[PDB]
Amino acid sequence: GVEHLLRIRLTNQLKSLKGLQSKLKDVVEYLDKVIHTILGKLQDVFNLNNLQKALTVKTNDELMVIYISNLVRSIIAFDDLIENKIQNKKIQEQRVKD
Amino acid sequence: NYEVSEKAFLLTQSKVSIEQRKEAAEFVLAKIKEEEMAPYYKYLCEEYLVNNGQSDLEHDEKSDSLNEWIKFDQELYNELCKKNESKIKELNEKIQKLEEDDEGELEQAQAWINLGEYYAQIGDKDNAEKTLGKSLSKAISTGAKIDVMLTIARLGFFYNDQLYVKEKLEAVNSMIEKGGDWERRNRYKTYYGIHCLAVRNFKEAAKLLVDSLATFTSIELTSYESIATYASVTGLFTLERTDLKSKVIDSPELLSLISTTAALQSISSLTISLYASDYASYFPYLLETYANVLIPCKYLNRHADFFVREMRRKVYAQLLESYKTLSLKSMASAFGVSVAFLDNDLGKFIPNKQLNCVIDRVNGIVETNRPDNKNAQYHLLVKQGDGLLTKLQKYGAAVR
Numbered sequence A: 001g002v003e004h005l006l007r008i009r010l011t012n013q014l015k016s017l018k019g020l021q022s023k024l025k026d027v028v029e030y031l032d033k034v035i036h037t038i039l040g041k042l043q044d045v046f047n048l049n050n051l052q053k054a055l056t057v058k059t060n061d062e063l064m065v066i067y068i069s070n071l072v073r074s075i076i077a078f079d080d081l082i083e084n085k086i087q088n089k090k091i092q093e094q095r096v097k098d
Numbered sequence B: 001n002y003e004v005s006e007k008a009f010l011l012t013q014s015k016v017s018i019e020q021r022k023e024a025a026e027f028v029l030a031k032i033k034e035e036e037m038a039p040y041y042k043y044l045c046e047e048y049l050v051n052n053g054q055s056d057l058e059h060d061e062k063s064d065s066l067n068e069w070i071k072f073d074q075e076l077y078n079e080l081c082k083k084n085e086s087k088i089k090e091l092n093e094k095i096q097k098l099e100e101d102d103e104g105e106l107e108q109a110q111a112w113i114n115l116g117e118y119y120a121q122i123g124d125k126d127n128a129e130k131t132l133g134k135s136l137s138k139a140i141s142t143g144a145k146i147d148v149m150l151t152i153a154r155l156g157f158f159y160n161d162q163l164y165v166k167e168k169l170e171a172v173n174s175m176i177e178k179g180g181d182w183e184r185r186n187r188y189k190t191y192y193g194i195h196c197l198a199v200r201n202f203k204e205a206a207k208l209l210v211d212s213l214a215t216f217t218s219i220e221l222t223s224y225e226s227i228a229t230y231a232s233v234t235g236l237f238t239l240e241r242t243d244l245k246s247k248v249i250d251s252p253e254l255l256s257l258i259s260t261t262a263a264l265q266s267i268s269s270l271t272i273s274l275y276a277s278d279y280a281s282y283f284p285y286l287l288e289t290y291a292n293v294l295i296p297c298k299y300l301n302r303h304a305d306f307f308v309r310e311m312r313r314k315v316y317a318q319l320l321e322s323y324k325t326l327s328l329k330s331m332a333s334a335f336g337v338s339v340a341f342l343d344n345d346l347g348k349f350i351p352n353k354q355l356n357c358v359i360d361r362v363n364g365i366v367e368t369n370r371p372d373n374k375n376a377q378y379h380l381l382v383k384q385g386d387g388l389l390t391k392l393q394k395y396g397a398a399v400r
Helices: A009-034 A037-047 A053-097 B002-011 B019-034 B038-047 B074-101 B106-122 B126-136 B142-158 B164-175 B182-195 B206-210 B224-238 B241-248 B252-258 B269-275 B282-294 B305-320 B328-334 B339-349 B380-397
Strands: none
Touching (some): A009 A037, A053 B380, B002 B142, B106 B142, B142 B164, B142 B182, B182 B206, B224 B252, B224 B282, B224 B305, B282 B305
16 A cells, blocks of 8 residues: 555665764764773674685685676677667668568 | 498508408409499599509500409400390380389389389499489388488498488488388488598587497498497597496497407407506507508598597596596506607697696606686686677678
8 A cells, every 4th residue: 555655776885884974973972971881882793805805715706607697698688689680670671662 | 332342442552461452352253243333343443543543444544453353354345235234125125014004103113213223233323313313203101212212322332422412311301201110210320420421520420320239231231340340439439438338338239249250449449448547558459440440441541540649639538537647757658659759649739728738847747737616617618608709790790
């Protein structure tokens, strides 16, 4: 019923950047408020090519295999362009005779 | 008809024994009396020259030969007319009476085929195909289709012509496809693998030959020992060692075929040495396979060097897969060859990218380059992937 009444990547990066800006203000305001327990929970998440250096070599090898599938699918889409170009001429050949 | 073409082929090249030409001449003299070989008998001087090809008493007058039985004389000239009257003049008069009396249908077509086969032995191919073409329209079922295909099948073996034969054999087989038994289909299947040796199709020849039986003998079309060498040599070069263990080296017929005659020297000497990885005695088997098999056979003499050169390249690949490194001193000495001989064979193979290997000079260690997980996606995916895109751009860049 909601869909009847109403009849991505950029947004994900904007809210991800604001997460560090909002967290930075919470640490500075809490620093002057005391002068460690609350900051301990944020340090647990913040600490957990730094740790991925061991997996960086294996990551690039997997990205190439992904491109192998994309390269094959791209050729399939390229064959339809030549097939449609020849098919478009068949319509033009009928317009010249008729 | 193949018995003469097989024996007289030894007259072309004999580098060792002279008696091989006189022994093969005995089989030729016996067959020319029963059937007239005049088309092939005249083809002897038109095939290979400067050996026996200059000796004739009729068309061209020169005497150079090791065999004096291939020249015309007063006896063969009279026998040529006697065989021409009985097989043509006497038979056509009886067939002419059957045409006016309207006796049978396929009987007159089969009589034209048997008569048409006689024109092939007289040396006239114009009337042979003319009488065969008239009987082709009468062919419906496989009764008259086998005889029509049999006449054209002789054109390939007897006249040694690979051009106009297969085109006619395929048209007759594709018109009505039945096949009868599996042996009548061999005429199209066996000649298929034989024709692949003329255009050098390599592995394509052994497709139907390996699955073919070893007891197949066509007599006048082909012999028993001749077809045995075609399937043994070509089948070994096609299927790799993975398929050799479950097919070639272990077979009910092939193990029975090697014990019949010693002229094979393929599924025994070459296969066992390849399976046991013994390179000491494997090298002299290639010389015996070249001299005593490839040379005497008809279609196996066309490639010549293309056998041993290619078979030596693949036998090293079986050794490179079983070791990461090797010893140059053991390969260039202990196996029965020299140092300069090993560098000559591997010299042309490396730049052709036919194998991946590491050859050492000072250290003397032959190392194998193994792609590991690369396999067929390393250099093949880029070459075949972008190479076919070049063929795709051929008709798209220039349009029409």
